């Protein structure tokens, strides 16, 4: 019979197979259901399809096509809920989100 | 000498949501390490869920309960609404 990749049937972009192995190898539980990978690739594929579209819309505003960490650091700290998910993470080459306390500004 | 990664996938998604933009290496190896972080929190969460309830195995539900704890706020109501939409399509297509 003809081979249809399991990532196709789910319609996902991330690979469901490669996850379905990683759940076994990482020793997360003694058995892994067939529903977990398909469900776990979607969530990943959703999030990774979130930071990017945000990063992209940050790239266009700096008049650069390509995404670079400085764009990512801007896409994550601006958003309020992504920042809360990655609260502890420190992005390499990331730079900081521009912020000056109002008391310091001259007058 | 192969170190498998998500460099193909993240790049494929990027064309779906920005058919023009392309991503640079040092920015990819972030995403390639962001996923490997989330996928190690979610799974690492639905490993304690199954253990607590004494269920031996890890199934999808145990992932919903794993997502609705980590992903904060509006993501939780969008991820699980994006997860089920996948798994429902899968079983019905098998």
């Amino acid at each position: 019979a003809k081979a249809k990749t399991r990532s196709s049937r789910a319609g996902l972009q991330f690979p469901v197979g490669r996850v379905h192995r990683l759940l076994r190898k990482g020793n997360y539980a003694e058995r892994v259901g067939a529903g977990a990978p398909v469900y776990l690739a979607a969530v990943l594929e959703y999030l990774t399809a979130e930071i990017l579209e945000l990063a992209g819309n940050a790239a266009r505003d700096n008049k650069k096509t390509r995404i670079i960490p400085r764009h990512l650091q801007l896409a994550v700290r601006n958003d309020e809920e992504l920042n809360k998910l990655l609260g502890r993470v420190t992005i390499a080459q990331g730079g900081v989100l521009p912020n000056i306390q109002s008391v310091l500004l001259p007058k | 000498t192969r170190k498998e990664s998500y460099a193909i996938y993240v790049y494929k998604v990027l064309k779906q949501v920005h058919p023009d933009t392309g991503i640079s290496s040092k920015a990819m190896s972030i995403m390639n390490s962001f996923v490997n972080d989330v996928f190690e929190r979610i799974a690492g969460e639905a490993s304690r869920l199954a253990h607590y309830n004494k269920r031996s195995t890890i199934t999808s539900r145990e992932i919903q309960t794993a997502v609705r704890l980590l992903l904060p706020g509006e993501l939780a109501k969008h991820a699980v609404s994006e997860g089920t939409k996948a798994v429902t399509k899968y079983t019905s297509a098998k």
């Binding site: 819309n57 940050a58 | 509006e74």
Partner: peptide, 14 residues
């Protein structure tokens, strides 16, 4: 102002 994201749209569009 020379470097800006301007935060076009924040709330999720699924």
């Amino acid at each position: 102002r020379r470097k800006i994201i301007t935060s076009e749209g924040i709330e999720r569009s699924f």
